[PDB]
């Protein structure tokens, strides 16, 4: 496979080239804003982002080597994590605000329009401020996002030869993260420390996704926020 034959810079090149675009929302600033309209905007945006995420996953090295059943499984458990880390990355340069779209910037005050959303908003803000303090690089972000895709579902799977292949790709991404930090002048002690700090953030992203997934499972029962057929299939994959 070409995934195990890629160098570090070639890995970064492939990941940077496969980046999905930043989509716009249908946000009308003049129009009044109900709790159901804000969620309608967030649902519409996330549904369109999902289509791009699926084609982005195809371009992640090693992902196409997997069986079709495993690709479905990895995306079903990781899709919200990937949306959330993308949101957090876009919001680094906007302290106290979440850039859902270039025309949709929300602070924690607007997040209060949806009940229970406040806690998830604050965790996303805290993750965004952590990236800002660490000065996370774009080359490091695409590595982390691809780690989430390959790691988040590998322990939720007779012939586990495909599981061993995912770990070989994960190790190559680790080599790529280290190659980036050594390129930026960090010492060996600094490289290992930064690598650990980044991967520990993925634990909190999993936490946010789990808490977010159960907030989405309740709004489906309320039937007030519209839910697309793809998102309902993604949401039912966790229940």
């Amino acid at each position: 496979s070409l995934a195990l034959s890629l160098t570090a810079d070639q890995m970064v090149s492939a990941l940077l080239d496969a980046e999905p675009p930043i989509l716009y929302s249908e946000y009308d600033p003049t129009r009044p804003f109900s709790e159901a309209s804000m969620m309608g905007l967030l649902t519409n945006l996330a549904d369109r982002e999902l289509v791009h995420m699926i084609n982005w996953a195809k371009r992640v090295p090693g992902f196409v080597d997997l069986t079709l059943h495993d690709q479905v499984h990895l995306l079903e458990c990781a899709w919200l994590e990937i949306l959330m880390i993308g949101l957090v990355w876009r919001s680094m340069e906007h302290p106290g605000k979440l850039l859902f779209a270039p025309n949709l910037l929300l602070d924690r005050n607007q997040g209060k329009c949806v009940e229970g959303m406040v806690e998830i908003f604050d965790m996303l803000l805290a993750t965004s401020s952590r990236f800002r303090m660490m000065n996370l690089q774009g080359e490091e972000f695409v590595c982390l996002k691809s780690i989430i895709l390959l790691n988040s579902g590998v322990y939720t799977f007779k012939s586990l030869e495909e599981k061993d292949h995912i770990h070989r790709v994960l190790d190559k991404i680790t080599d790529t993260l280290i190659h980036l930090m050594a390129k930026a002048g960090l010492t060996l002690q600094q490289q290992h420390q930064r690598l650990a700090q980044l991967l520990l953030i993925l634990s909190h992203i999993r936490h946010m996704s789990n808490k977010g997934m159960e907030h989405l499972y309740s709004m489906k029962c309320k039937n007030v926020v519209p839910l697309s057929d793809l998102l309902l299939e993604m949401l039912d994959a966790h229940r």
């Binding site: 996953a57 079709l68 299939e233």
Partner: peptide, 9 residues
């Protein structure tokens, strides 16, 4: 699954 079809095409 919609996800399955989109991963094929």
């Amino acid at each position: 699954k919609i996800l399955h079809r989109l991963l094929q095409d």
